[PDB]
């Protein structure tokens, strides 16, 4: 439902 | 799906270390950050640490630097966190989350 | 670290009621934020996430909003099955960073 905009900077 | 599944409840003895486990399911396990959050009656929600399976890369609480250690395992889509010299004050619930899904918690009781 | 003021820290309703619960970042956090419930023993469950995308499942009852320090999660008419602690949770920048969490008991 979500995508990387759960801010997948990585660290 | 939306999942993450935690390993059981832990009971160790002062001084040890376990190995808490968060297994993902539903999504591209490569693609999102697995943190771990603690949580106890006196201290409250506590962010440990993440992990992005992709890169491996880790961003860690100071607090935590030396303390914690977080890895992925891309096989099993498995994030894991690891606790060393435990001492009561580590005694908590364990929570490994998606940012916007979380796993059950895992119980950890460091008591002689 | 980003502060997350929360609030109210207490909060008696009734069923059926509208409620608002509202978080302060100490500075801008680019609606990176979530609301989650988390009842007595049970594990979180977020509601929203980015400020005001409802999760999937999550009754549309629930709604939240806010564009800089200040977010709000509203909730349009107060169920049973809502009762517990609601937070929020901030991510744009490390170290995550949760609210002090309100509580909600019903009214008597």
């Known amino acids: 439902d979500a995508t990387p905009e759960d801010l997948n900077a990585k660290l | 799906q939306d999942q993450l599944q935690q390993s059981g409840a832990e009971l160790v003895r002062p001084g040890a270390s376990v190995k808490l486990s968060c297994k993902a399911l539903?999504?591209?396990?490569?693609?999102?950050?697995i943190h771990w959050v603690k949580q106890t009656p006196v201290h409250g929600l506590e962010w440990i640490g993440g992990i992005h399976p992709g890169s491996s890369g880790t961003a860690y609480n100071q607090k935590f630097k030396g303390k914690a250690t977080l890895t992925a395992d891309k096989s099993s889509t498995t994030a894991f966190m690891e606790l060393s010299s435990l001492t009561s004050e580590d005694s908590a619930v364990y929570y490994c989350?998606?940012?916007?899904?979380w796993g059950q918690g895992t119980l950890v009781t460091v008591s002689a | 670290d980003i502060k997350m003021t929360q609030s109210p820290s207490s909060m008696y309703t009734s069923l059926g009621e509208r409620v608002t619960i509202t978080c302060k970042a100490s500075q801008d956090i680019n609606s990176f934020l979530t609301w989650f419930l988390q009842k007595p023993g049970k594990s979180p469950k977020t509601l929203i996430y980015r400020a005001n995308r409802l999760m999937i499942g999550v009754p549309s009852r629930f709604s939240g909003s806010g564009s800089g320090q200040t977010y709000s999660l509203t909730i349009s008419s107060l169920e049973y099955e809502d009762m517990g602690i609601y937070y929020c949770?901030?991510?744009?920048?490390?170290?995550?960073?949760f609210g002090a969490g309100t509580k909600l008991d019903l009214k008597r």
């Open positions: 539903g999504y591209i396990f490569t693609d999102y950050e």
């Open positions: 949770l901030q991510y744009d920048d490390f170290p995550l960073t």
């Open positions: 989350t998606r940012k916007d899904y």
